[PDB]
Amino acid sequence: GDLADRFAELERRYDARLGVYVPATGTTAAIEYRADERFAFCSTFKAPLVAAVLHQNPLTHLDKLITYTSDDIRSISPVAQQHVQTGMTIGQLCDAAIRYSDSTAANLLLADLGGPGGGTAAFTGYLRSLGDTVSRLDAEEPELNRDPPGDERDTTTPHAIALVLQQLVLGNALPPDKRALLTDWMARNTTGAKRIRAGFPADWKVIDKTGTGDYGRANDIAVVWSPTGVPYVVAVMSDRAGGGYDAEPREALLAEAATCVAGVLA
């Protein structure tokens, strides 16, 4: 059989472009499909963004209260838009940015990193520090979701983002306590039930961060644990750019790609 043929069939059936990377392990081959092609990050950047903030600061920094106004609310901020009066701590922002894809939380965390482009250069530099020379973040939320196809701004590749997530969750890019916090936030994500999680059987643990955007963009980056506790990183990226800027993102495409991946990792 050829798994690449089955990913090509998903592309045909969904009128989509699919990218997949599952890093090789001591026990498994890599899975790679369009893995070095660029795809918009969309909100998947929020996971390494939280890592960047954790990396740059002592854990006491999670208790720092960030204040902001209703004018700071960006598409879409399910948690921050209910705490304009109280503010939110850096830790609460990390929680919201990963678990609810909260865009104001991510923009405040970008600002916390500092520097030109409201933290986007800093974020890109953090990925460079992890050995990623391809990915780049150029815009804040929500504009980073809306670049036209072929524009390299705000893109990564499945290969790059998978190896970033590998280093962050399974590897030693972060000290183990900071790594635990990232992992726990991804483990309690609320936005991913219909994506990678939908493709892995219920006895596999799934932690993830989604992204969605223009041109039918739908992404999910996950770490999965088998029922025997063996971890894998699964990066699935998709768009439907042939359909135009308002092409519908298709979560099912990601669930079915994940099902094909689960099939070979079983």
Ligand X SMILES: *C(=O)/C=C/N[C@@H](C(=O)O)C(C)(C)S(=O)O
To the nearest whole angstrom, how small is the minimum distance from the Cβ of residue 115 to ligand X? Answer: 22
Minimum distance, C-beta of residue 41 to ligand X, in the bound complex (Å): 8
> Can you tell me which of 16, 18, 42, 224 binds ligand X, judged by CB under 6 A?
42
By the rule CB under 6 A, 101 interacts with ligand X: yes
Is 103 a known active-site residue? no
Closest separation in Å from C-beta 265 to ligand X: 26
User: With CB under 6 A as the contact rule, which of the stretches 16-24, 30-38, 175-183, 207-215 interacts with ligand X?
Assistant: 207-215
CA angle (41, 62, 57) in 5-degree steps:
75
202 token code pair = 């219920």
Nearest-angstrom CA–CA distance, 46 and 56: 15
Cβ atoms < 10 Å from Cβ of 172: 9
Asked if 212 touches ligand X (CB under 6 A), the answer is yes
| Distance in angstroms (rounded) separating the CA atoms of residues 113 and 52 | 8
Q: Is 48 in the site for ligand X (CB under 6 A)?
A: no
Among residues 112 and 214, whose Cβ is nearest to ligand X?
A: 214
Q: Of 134, 148, 163, 127, whose CA–CA distance to 45 is shortest?
A: 127
Nearer to ligand X, 92 or 212 (CB): 212
Residue closest to ligand X when measured from CB atoms: 43
Amino acid found at 54: L
The one catalytic residue among 32, 140, 141, 256? 141
CB of 52 to ligand X, least distance (A): 17
As a residue count, the chain comes to 266
Among 76, 111, 187, 198, binds ligand X (CB under 6 A): 76
Q: Please, what is the angle between helix 176-187 and helix 46-56, to 10°?
A: 150
Active-site hit among 32, 43, 77, 101: 43
145 near ligand X, judged by CB under 6 A:
yes
Identify whether the C-beta of residue 51 lies closer than 8 Å to the C-beta of residue 113. no
**Of these, 23, 91, 213, 216, which contacts ligand X (CB under 6 A)?**
213
Count residues near ligand X (CB under 6 A).
Answer: 11
**Strand stretches in the chain, DSSP E:** 17-22, 31-33, 39-40, 65-66, 88-89, 155-156, 205-213, 217-225, 231-239
- For position 77 contacting ligand X by CB under 6 A, the verdict is no
CB of 26 to ligand X, least distance (A): 32
User: Rounded to whole angstroms, how far apart are CA atoms 154 and 157?
Assistant: 11
Check residue 169 and report its DSSP letter: I
Q: Is 32 a catalytic residue?
A: no
Q: What are the residue numbers of the active site?
A: 43, 141
- Binding-site ranges for ligand X (CB under 6 A): 42-43, 75-76, 101, 142, 145-146, 211-213
